[PDB]
Amino acid sequence: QSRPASDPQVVEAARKEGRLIIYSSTDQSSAQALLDDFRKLYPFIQIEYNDLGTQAIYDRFVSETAAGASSADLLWSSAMELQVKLASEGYALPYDSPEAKNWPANARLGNLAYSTTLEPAVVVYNKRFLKPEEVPTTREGLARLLQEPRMRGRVATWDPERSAVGFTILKADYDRFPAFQELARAFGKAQAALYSSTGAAFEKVISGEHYLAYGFFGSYALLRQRTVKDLGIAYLTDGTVAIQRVAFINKRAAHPNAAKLFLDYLLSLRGQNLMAYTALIFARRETVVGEATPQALYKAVGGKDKVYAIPVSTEILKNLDPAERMRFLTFWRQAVR
Ligand SMILES: [Mg+2]
């Protein structure tokens, strides 16, 4: 492919920095090919990739900043509310990425933070327990399946009280899809187990302890499928929540220029193509080729109209308002117990 269009003076300043600290919720097993390809472009950048939980990224970054400590150069996290909160509160370096000129307004927070992905919340299942034909592709259908005695104890979904991105996804589902309330009651009926990481849910599904998991990232499911033939993916045809993994540069980065190079790389055709084709991370750009693409998602759900892309906007900070959080979690807690 190409090289990202970062200014040659940023490249020279990144070479004097020589180092890049990343705090990321992107599982290293998915991120690795992007780190490897970024090092081929810029081998003089020593990367410290910190694979961390979404809430752990926000708590660590805020304390280290409060203490005047060494923190990250770049934060990359699926917990969209916590990224937007930081980037709208003075923590972000303002930077107009020359790779984001065609980003729509709802995929960027001006010059403070950026969408890097369009990642669907999907259904995964174990083909030894559920044939593809048995797996409903709507919230109503899934709620009916979860009335079956045989499904009791055989469902996984997020714990929105322990995963900040589990909150992002289930809260967006709750806000947009009336059918979600009926589904959440069916989670209660089926005694759903609640997980705070995708791999923990997936291993239960792979072992057959659960037959089906709702709401986890299509990205991770596609990569896991390469080595697990019995892992099925179903896309919701009544409406799919998509998260946009948000990246921003630490205003107090020790290596701002190295962080600019990495952000430009993530947004570039080269980076987005590597996401779609090799990392199997569902890319933001619609001009990418591979399995993990907007066009493959749109085809699976029956069109772009059936995707609800959570915007990279301070409007989503509504979800952290105390009364709003209380309404959703009081509903959730009652439905699922
Ligand atoms: Mg992760």
Provide the 10 A C-beta neighbour count for residue 194: 19
Question: b/e string for 305-327 if b means 16 or more Cβ within 10 A?
Answer: ebbbbbbbbeebbebeeeeebee
Q: Which residues on neighbouring strands pair with residue 21, listed in sequence order?
A: 48
Q: What method did the depositors use to determine the structure?
A: X-ray
Backbone angles phi, psi at 48, to 5 degrees: -110, 100
Q: How far is the CA of 168 from the centre of ligand 1 (A)?
A: 14
Q: Which residue has the tokens 């107090």?
A: 252
* Pair (231, 129) in one structural domain: yes
**Residue 73 Cα distances to 185, 196, 253, 265, 294, angstroms:** 42, 26, 4, 15, 29
Q: How far is the CA of 53 from the centre of ligand 1 (A)?
A: 6
Question: b/e string for 74-86 if b means 16 or more Cβ within 10 A?
Answer: bbbbbbbbbbbbb
Q: How far is the CA of 133 from the centre of ligand 1 (A)?
A: 30
Q: Is residue 144 helix, strand or coil?
A: helix
* Pair (327, 315) in one structural domain: no
Q: Spell out the alpha helix ranges (H) of the chain.
A: 8-17, 28-41, 54-66, 80-87, 139-145, 164-176, 179-189, 198-207, 218-227, 256-267, 269-274, 294-301, 322-336
* Pair (223, 337) in one structural domain: yes
d(CA 113, CA 84): 7
Binding-site residues from annotation for Mn(2+): 27
Domains identified in the chain, total number? 2
* Pair (159, 54) in one structural domain: no
Q: What's the chain's Rg over C-alpha atoms?
A: 20
Q: Which residues on neighbouring strands pair with residue 126, listed in sequence order?
A: 231
Q: How far is the CA of 283 from the centre of ligand 1 (A)?
A: 17
d(CA 257, CA 1): 22
Q: How far is the CA of 23 from the centre of ligand 1 (A)?
A: 11
Q: Which residue has the tokens 């987005």?
A: 272
* Pair (184, 152) in one structural domain: yes
d(CA 283, CA 280): 8
* Pair (302, 220) in one structural domain: no
* Pair (11, 155) in one structural domain: no
Q: How far is the CA of 266 from the centre of ligand 1 (A)?
A: 17
Binding-site residues from annotation for Mg(2+): 25, 27
- In contact, 192 and 332? CB cutoff 8 Å: no
Q: How far is the CA of 287 from the centre of ligand 1 (A)?
A: 26
* Pair (187, 279) in one structural domain: no
Q: How far is the CA of 281 from the centre of ligand 1 (A)?
A: 12
Both tokens assigned to 151: 């499904």
Q: How far is the CA of 12 from the centre of ligand 1 (A)?
A: 32
d(CA 71, CA 138): 43
* Pair (94, 205) in one structural domain: no
- In contact, 279 and 35? CB cutoff 8 Å: no
Q: How far is the CA of 78 from the centre of ligand 1 (A)?
A: 8
Both tokens assigned to 98: 């020359």
* Pair (209, 337) in one structural domain: yes
Q: Which of 191, 197, 202, 187 is nearest to 163 (CA)?
A: 197
For residue 96, count CB atoms less than 10 angstroms from its CB and return exposed for 0-12, middle for 13-18, buried for 19 or more: exposed
d(CA 103, CA 206): 37
Q: Which of 255, 248, 285, 191 is nearest to 14 (CA)?
A: 255
- In contact, 263 and 249? CB cutoff 8 Å: yes
Q: Is residue 122 helix, strand or coil?
A: strand
* Pair (332, 218) in one structural domain: yes
Domain coverage including residue 194: 118-243+321-337
* Pair (185, 75) in one structural domain: no
- In contact, 126 and 202? CB cutoff 8 Å: no
- In contact, 235 and 300? CB cutoff 8 Å: yes
Binding-site residues from annotation: 25, 27
Q: Spell out the alpha helix ranges (H) of 54-163.
A: 54-66, 80-87, 139-145
Both tokens assigned to 248: 């921003």
Q: How far is the CA of 26 from the centre of ligand 1 (A)?
A: 5
